[PDB]
């Protein structure tokens, strides 16, 4: 409803930025998110008011904004915003480990990636697959060699990034980059500015069926 207008016409551009007075480990992780996406730019958040940030970004004509929140170095939340009064999803992060912690094996690939979405079934699954795949560079080639996997595992989006290469006897893998267990917890039709827009969906923590169902 805000993506058929500019689905594969314009390639997006993404600004990735941290919460407020961030940690060094958080800024490393934000750099890793910038390297995860194509055509994204990490922007230093310090003394940036969120309203003048968000409308300066929308007059600069960017498409998406990804802020990040932390707790004692460990990153805990991110927020996808779409700018022409588009929706914001906001997710939490659970098992986050990074290549700056694990291995200094050189640089990443930065190629236009492929995308895999495992069992996004429901209508909320289609809405979140739209909000996740419309932040990637539109129409990659055939022999593009990094893929991203977003597997729904009981509302826990496992996110990994791999560089594959086809043999003739199969295809072997090398994962690299981040590793997420993210989960959706809010989604609203306004931008990040308002906290006044209509809640399209947020999870109910405190009903008496809070653990039985999937994509609550």
């Amino acid at each position: 409803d805000e993506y058929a207008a500019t689905s594969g016409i314009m390639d997006p551009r993404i600004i990735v930025t941290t919460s407020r007075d961030p940690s060094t480990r958080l800024s490393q992780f934000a750099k890793e998110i910038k390297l995860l996406f194509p055509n994204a730019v990490r922007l230093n958040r310090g003394n940036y008011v969120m309203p003048n940030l968000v409308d300066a970004c929308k007059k600069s004509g960017t498409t998406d904004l990804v802020v990040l929140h932390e707790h004692r170095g460990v990153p805990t939340s991110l927020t996808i915003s779409h700018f022409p009064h588009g929706p914001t999803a906001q997710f939490s992060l659970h098992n986050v480990v990074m290549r700056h912690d694990i291995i200094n094996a050189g640089n990443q690939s930065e190629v236009n990636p492929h995308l895999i979405f495992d069992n996004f079934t429901t209508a909320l699954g289609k809405r979140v697959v739209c909000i996740l795949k419309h932040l990637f560079n539109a129409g990659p080639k055939k022999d593009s060699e990094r893929v991203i996997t977003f597997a729904n595992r009981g509302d826990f989006i496992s996110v990994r990034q791999h560089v594959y290469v086809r043999t003739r006897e199969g295809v072997e893998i090398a994962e690299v980059g981040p590793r997420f267990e993210m989960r959706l917890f809010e989604l609203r039709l306004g931008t990040l500015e308002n906290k006044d827009a209509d809640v399209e969906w947020q999870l109910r923590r405190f009903i008496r069926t809070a653990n039985k169902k999937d994509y609550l």
Binding site: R99, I103, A105, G106, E145, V163, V165, E172, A174, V176
Partner: peptide
């Protein structure tokens, strides 16, 4: 590490962590 894994073809990082120097 694409060239290094291509060398591994023509000839798995995240299950081990590490630490700092001395």
């Amino acid at each position: 590490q694409l060239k290094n894994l291509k060398a591994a073809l023509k000839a798995n990082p995240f299950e081990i962590k590490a630490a700092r120097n001395k």
